């Protein structure tokens, strides 16, 4: 095989999403997801207190993105980032959680590119 | 069922002394929440001191690390600030807050303030 | 096409290569998780039971930096020799062999280039 | 000179008592090494008790955790086994071991063994 698969998501804050796997190297999977879970843990107060409906979808898009054919990268839309940031920034400031440089919302797409660049995914 | 936070435990101590602030929230509140301690010196901006989620996660301002401890009694909906090794620079009015969300609508309540004064 | 950072893992210094690919979101967190996974093996590396052990461990936790951050893996034969040569010492120190190190899971290193290749350093 | 292991400290104690084994390595050995204690009761298989590297990493058999302590003096190449809360089931010949590698060649030396006997 290729050495990669869609692996079950084991990040504790990325359960009960519309999808349940993410693209990972087979041998490095548990290690990679353990590292992602560690990186995501500082955001737990925001996820638990639910300051934004957009926050968990945004973070899980970055740490456990939907599994695509050939492992293609997917990204959340800039507007999602911006609303998650705005709605959760008071609580992030209260708990000393900085917004990482690699999450600066200007880095994310406007979601106005022709299909398949921007698309809608349906879930039953 | 109306929500109010009431503060106590401030006063005057000499430098090196200790104080314990208490902030008791009464009324109908969400059991998943954050509670914080803030302070404001006369004429200056209000500043975060420490915060704690209902789960027990804490955050501390650098200026108070190792000296102050925040803790809570969820049974009592009360948050505490144990203030050891007090310095004159800790003099300020101390405020507690209670922060939670219901269907993503923010609720942010504040206590009435308690004066802390640390003499030379 | 490269984003290589210096290898900071203490057990993965003085290798033929000195950088590794680190995704921005995972930096620091990765080295914390790697140090935790490698710590049980510190006696194996220090006492030097196998020439193959440190290369194998660092292949998993500090792999060579590739264009586009491509994944590389050590060969099954490397895993097998590192395991057999260090098994006496690992048993003496009660060091378990993790699931993600089971040697049968690693490549036979017989796929056509570039799937298997030789890297030169001289 | 050639490597030699000298053991001492065995003997007879009542259950609940204590003993200290020592094992002194002489000769040309690597300063980076592991030293261990193993035990074998007559008619039974030899079993690991505890081990320690020159760096200080330790490992203990579950049956002796909290009762036995292994330690070493790198200066004199000596390993010790402090055996507290002894039980009749600890009765056995205890062997010291020295394991190291030079250019990936294994050197593995064994002491002569010393008897530990724990009465009811
Ligand atoms: C993940 O979702 C797929 C499709 O919805 C399902 O077939 C699979 O069983 C799920 N995995 C679980 C529930 O562990
Ligand atoms: C890493 O190795 C390369 C190639 O030998 C060399 O050019 C570079 O200076 C090295 N970097 C460090 C920090 O040693």
Numbering used by the authors:
A (entry chain D): 23 to 146
B (entry chain B), D (entry chain A): 0 to 119
C (entry chain C): 25 to 146
Q: What wording appears in the published article?
A:
We determined the crystal structure of the FZD3 CRD in complex with Nb8 to 1.8 Å resolution. Although the FZD3/6 subgroup CRD sequences have diverged from other Frizzled family members, the structure revealed an evolutionarily conserved FZD CRD fold. The complex structure shows how Nb8 ‘wraps around’ the FZD3 CRD at the base of the lipid-binding groove using a concave surface formed by the three CDRs as well as their surrounding sequences. Consistent with their high binding affinity, the CRD and Nb8 respectively contribute 1300 and 1360 Å² of their surface area to the interaction interface in the complex. For example, FZD3 M116 forms hydrophobic interactions with Nb8 Y37, N96 and L98. Hydrogen bonds also form between FZD3 K112 and Nb8 E103 and D105. The binding epitope is moderately to poorly conserved among the 10 human FZD CRDs, providing a rationale to explain the high degree of FZD3-binding specificity exhibited by Nb8. Additionally, the groove in the FZD3 CRD is narrower than that observed in the FZD8 Wnt3 complex. The end of helix 3 in the FZD3 CDR is shifted closer to helix 1 by some 5.9 Å (as measured for the Cα atoms of F117 in FZD3 and Y125 in FZD8) compared to its position for a lipid-accommodating groove in FZD8. It is possible this groove narrowing conformation exists when no Wnt ligand engaged, but also possible it might be due to the nanobody binding, given the extensive interactions between Nb8 (mediated by Y37 from CDR1; L47 and T52 from CDR2, and N96 from CDR3) with the end of the FZD3 CRD helix 3. Our structural superposition indicates that Nb8 binding would hinder formation of the CRD dimerization interface.
